[PDB]
Ligand binder design. Structure first.
Ligand SMILES: *[C@@H]1O[C@H](CO)[C@@H](O[C@@H]2O[C@H](CO)[C@@H](O)[C@H](O)[C@H]2NC(C)=O)[C@H](O)[C@H]1NC(C)=O
Ligand SMILES: *[C@@H]1O[C@H](CO)[C@@H](O[C@@H]2O[C@H](CO)[C@@H](O)[C@H](O)[C@H]2NC(C)=O)[C@H](O)[C@H]1NC(C)=O
Ligand SMILES: *[C@@H]1O[C@H](CO)[C@@H](O)[C@H](O)[C@H]1NC(C)=O
Ligand SMILES: *[C@@H]1O[C@H](CO)[C@@H](O)[C@H](O)[C@H]1NC(C)=O
Ligand code: NA
Ligand code: NA
Ligand code: NA
Ligand code: NA
Ligand SMILES: [Zn+2]
Length: 856
């Protein structure tokens, strides 16, 4: 008879300090712990509720120069709680200490205190143990008040064999031999922090280190065979840590910061205070083999994790309904920091693309407000999504533009200073921002309702009429305070207008030839132009496209196709606009063009539409052919030029543009004749391998080199190529082997499943594999995880028939408690519903447009 019936812990028993002793055995794969937690009670009680999950509690006692007594233990596994019953009611305000002894098995998933393995370059299997606790898995490693507002200090001790190294949040202060072959490591006490930030790793990692100008020792740890790839991340971390310390004027408060590359890791990285963790591919850099995309990705990932030391660790959201205060800010700070520390990366131009990814899900009924209630672990994991990360960063960027960078920076500094070592709510951020303007009323419209507005512009002479309405595919009365911006043919000053009502008007000083709203796409909204608007802007792009900025051109491309879905613009007119790209040069507008047009043939690929699919792909290649032909088969140029080269050559080869295929075939044959020892330009390797893997001999040869590669980029490039074969038996093998995790690690499975889901002949196999192996995949990755969401959407969200829709509805319906209520399931259902309507309306229009298409 359990005495607590709520998922949320009681509020009146509060921890102050934890002493954690962990003794793990990396041979038996078990661990023992003793947890002592200093607590004080706000009000008298005789029961203490806390979290524990899959931990066998052997004994629990309560300690008051005096006194100690036993506690009865009850468990409620579904609430993931245990209850400790005291003989006497606890006394208010007096310090107690709860001592719990327990045992567990190392987790075989990617969360909790889990097993990771790797093979030495000689073939020896090695075992390590690592942690991943965010959001609710600390309770799988020690019993705790496992909610992020129950902050405390942590003194961690690790018992281990002499052959192993242990690291944790804080520096090692002492090692004591306790028994024959057993050493006890004492780490220094942490600052006050949430339980999800606790971390420890038992490994044989090696490290390299560098000291910041502020005296912080920064280290990168990795397996011995890969530590020579740590130099780039080490240098970036020192630079970025120094940047944030100087930017926030709040020092990093710990003596050291570690970045650890874990051989098995579910996400990309995690911000544990003093001991940040990473997938090997997100941290390690090979100067000969790593891609430009990889260098960018490592830099931004490190910038994200180090931003979290302030936005997340120092200041933490009070509850997961406001996770965006962690994740939106860390995502935004990636661009603030890296635009200064690595200007050659030009990260600023990539930002708006995240906003368009957020708008993809946020246009659906099944989106949710940035701030929204959650209760159980699955729901909490679902908050780590494009709304929290990307919409969060996008509305912060919009607010920064509205307030000015200086007022925004003063706001976030006051916010961080005032709430240091505490927790914040949505409202606390607005109050800090206003202390520098009714920010609260405005930002409440952007955080407490889902979606975004369509802004409709109607011009009569000098009179510019504006209307807002909720953009939904494909009428709730939603209203926003929208900080509009515009430029005109007569003024490229960024003009501002705060639209607070359904309609409003502004008067231009003189008539203009065109007007363009949402300058640089810094606003989280889309724009429709009535009357001759889209013709006028289409003419601008086709005549003098440089009359507006690259990012303004990308915004026009994106918005035109979004307006097709709600019937405000014909597919023919949006496709007509896209034709200006034949004269475009810039990565962002070209990338945006690809990102609007590729998804159209991805729908056709899953239909009996080979004729139009082939003509559409030939149109795409012809549209970009001049740019394709100018690409050199080298690694020259900027990061943007290199990413553009790699993507264009891949596109051209996969769609059988013969000049590219023939050159890629030659490089692959030479690479194979060299026994895989030939150094190819990294930027052409995706295309070369993707062509090579189309034959059985080439696929088999590529796979044979995957075993021995120490390069994350090369393994990623091989994986992509292997997933592109039309040989169904090979596709099935990849699914089976990465599912098993021996020949290909299970951390790659979600990406392999999705790539095969996008394969024009493999997509039935991937959806089938997901259905057949659902229960084991959920057990490995967890309901609500981003990984499960990626697998659900990546195998299903390009279907466009009523028969496929019912397959999806019927399958997930049948799962009941094991998945039927997933948000990603409702999102993919609504996406397929929109695909059905969009294809039913537009397919014949596209077919005719392509035939008429003599412009090319
Ligand atoms: C760790 O795994 C072992 C599996 O061997 C679990 O031990 C079994 O538990 C059941 C039920 O309690 C017993 O009937 C078996 O006899 C146990 N097996 C052995 C070999 O002793 C153990 O419960 C797991 N630990 C936790 C904390 O879940
Ligand atoms: C993990 O367990 C193994 C065995 O269960 C421990 O290995 C023993 O270590 C002692 C002293 O080092 C040796 O005398 C025994 O011969 C070992 N037994 C075996 C089967 O190898 C190991 O020390 C444990 N490690 C930890 C960290 O607890
Ligand atoms: C959106 O979902 C809600 C509840 O799920 C429903 O009441 C509403 O009708 C939906 N909107 C549309 C356009 O289907
Ligand atoms: C080719 O093999 C040599 C000898 O083992 C090695 O040193 C070199 O790095 C290899 N080159 C590539 C591109 O793999
Ligand atoms: Na556990
Ligand atoms: Na909103
Ligand atoms: Na939203
Ligand atoms: Na249309
Ligand atoms: Zn984050």
């Amino acid at each position: 008879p359990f005495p607590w019936n709520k998922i949320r812990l009681p509020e009146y028993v509060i921890p102050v300090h934890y002493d954690l002793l962990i003794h793990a055995n990396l041979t038996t794969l078990t661990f023992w712990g003793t947890t002592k937690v200093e607590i004080t009670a706000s009000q008298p009680t005789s029961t203490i509720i806390l979290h524990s999950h899959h931990l066998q509690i052997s004994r629990a006692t309560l300690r008051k120069r005096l006194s100690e007594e036993p506690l009865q233990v009850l468990e409620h596994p579904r609430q993931e709680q245990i209850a400790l019953l005291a003989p006497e009611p606890l006394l208010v305000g007096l310090p107690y200490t709860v001592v719990i002894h327990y045992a567990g098995n190392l987790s075989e998933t990617f969360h909790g205190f889990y097993k990771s393995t790797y093979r030495t370059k000689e073939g020896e299997l090695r075992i390590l143990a690592s942690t991943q606790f965010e959001p609710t898995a600390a309770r799988m490693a020690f019993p705790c008040f496992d909610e992020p507002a129950f902050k405390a200090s942590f003194s961690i001790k690790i018992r281990r064999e002499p052959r192993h190294l242990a690291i944790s949040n804080m520096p090692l202060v002492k090692s004591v031999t306790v028994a024959e072959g057993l050493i006890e490591d004492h780490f220094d006490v942490t600052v006050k922090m949430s339980t999800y930030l606790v971390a420890f790793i038992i490994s044989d990692f090696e490290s390299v280190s560098k000291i910041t100008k502020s005296g912080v020792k920064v280290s990168v740890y990795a397996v011995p065979d890969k530590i020579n790839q740590a130099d780039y991340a080490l240098d970036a971390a020192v630079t970025l840590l120094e940047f944030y310390e100087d930017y926030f004027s709040i020092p990093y408060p710990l003596p050291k910061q570690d970045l650890a590359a874990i051989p098995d890791f579910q996400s990309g990285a995690m911000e544990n205070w003093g001991l940040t963790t990473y997938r090997e591919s997100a941290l390690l850099f090979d100067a000969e083999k790593s891609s430009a995309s990889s260098k960018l990705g490592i830099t931004m990932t490190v910038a994200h994790e180090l931003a979290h030391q302030w936005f997340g660790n120092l200041v933490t959201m009070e509850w997961w309904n406001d996770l965006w205060l962690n994740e939106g800010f860390a995502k935004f700070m990636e661009f603030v920091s890296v635009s200064v520390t690595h200007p050659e990366l030009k990260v600023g131009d990539y930002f708006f693309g995240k906003c368009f990814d957020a708008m993809e899900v946020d246009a659906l009924n099944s989106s949710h407000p940035v701030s929204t209630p959650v209760e159980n672990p699955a729901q909490i994991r679902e908050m780590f999504d494009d709304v929290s990360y990307d919409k969060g960063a996008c509305i912060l960027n919009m607010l920064r533009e509205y307030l000015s960078a200086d007022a925004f920076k003063s706001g976030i500094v006051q916010y961080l200073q005032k709430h240091s070592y505490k927790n914040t709510k949505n409202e606390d951020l607005w109050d800090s921002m206003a202390s520098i303007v009714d920010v609260k009323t405005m930002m409440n419209t952007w955080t407490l309702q889902k979606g975004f507005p369509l802004i409709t512009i109607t011009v009569r002479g000098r009179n510019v009429h504006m209307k807002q309405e909720h953009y939904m595919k494909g009428d709730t009365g939603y209203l926003w305070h929208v900080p509009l911006t515009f430029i005109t043919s007569k003024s490229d000053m960024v003009h501002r207008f705060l639209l607070k009502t359904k309609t409003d008007v502004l008067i231009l000083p003189e008539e203009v030839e065109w007007i363009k709203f949402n300058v640089g796409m810094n606003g989280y909204y889309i724009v429709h132009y009535e009357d001759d608007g889209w013709d006028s802007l289409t003419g601008l792009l086709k005549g003098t496209h440089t009359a507006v900025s690259s990012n303004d051109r990308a915004s026009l491309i994106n918005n035109a196709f979004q307006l097709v879905s709600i019937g405000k613009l014909s597919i023919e007119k949006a496709l007509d606009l896209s034709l200006y790209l034949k004269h475009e040069t810039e990565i962002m507008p070209v990338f945006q063009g690809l990102n609007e047009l590729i998804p159209m043939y991805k729908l056709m690929e899953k239909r009996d539409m080979n004729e139009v699919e082939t003509q559409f792909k030939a149109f795409l290649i012809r549209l970009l052919r001049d740019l394709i032909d100018k690409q050199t088969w080298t690694d020259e140029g900027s990061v943007s030029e290199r990413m553009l080269r790699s993507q264009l050559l891949l596109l051209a080869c996969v769609h059988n543009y013969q000049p590219c295929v023939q050159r890629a075939e030659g490089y692959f044959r030479k690479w194979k004749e060299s026994n895989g020892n030939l150094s190819l330009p990294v930027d052409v390797t995706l295309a070369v391998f993707a062509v090579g893997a189309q034959s059985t001999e080439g696929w088999d040869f590529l796979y044979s080199k995957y075993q021995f590669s120490l390069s994350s980029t090369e393994k990623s490039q091989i994986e992509f190529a292997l997933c592109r074969t039309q040989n169904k038996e090979k596709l099935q093998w990849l699914l089976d082997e990465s599912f098993k995790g021996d020949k290909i690690k299970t951390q790659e499975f979600p990406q392999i499943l999705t790539l095969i889901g996008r394969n024009p002949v493999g997509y039935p196999l991937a959806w089938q594999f997901l259905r057949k192996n659902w229960n084991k995949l959920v057990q490995k990755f967890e309901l609500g995880s981003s990984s499960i969401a990626h697998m659900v959407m990546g195998t299903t969200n390009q279907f466009s028939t009523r028969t496929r829709l019912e397959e999806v509805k019927g399958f997930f319906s049948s799962l009941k408690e094991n998945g039927s209520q997933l948000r990603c399931v409702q999102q993919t259902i609504e996406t397929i519903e929109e695909n059905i309507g969009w294809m039913d309306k537009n397919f014949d229009k596209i077919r005719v447009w392509l035939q008429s298409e003599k412009l090319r």
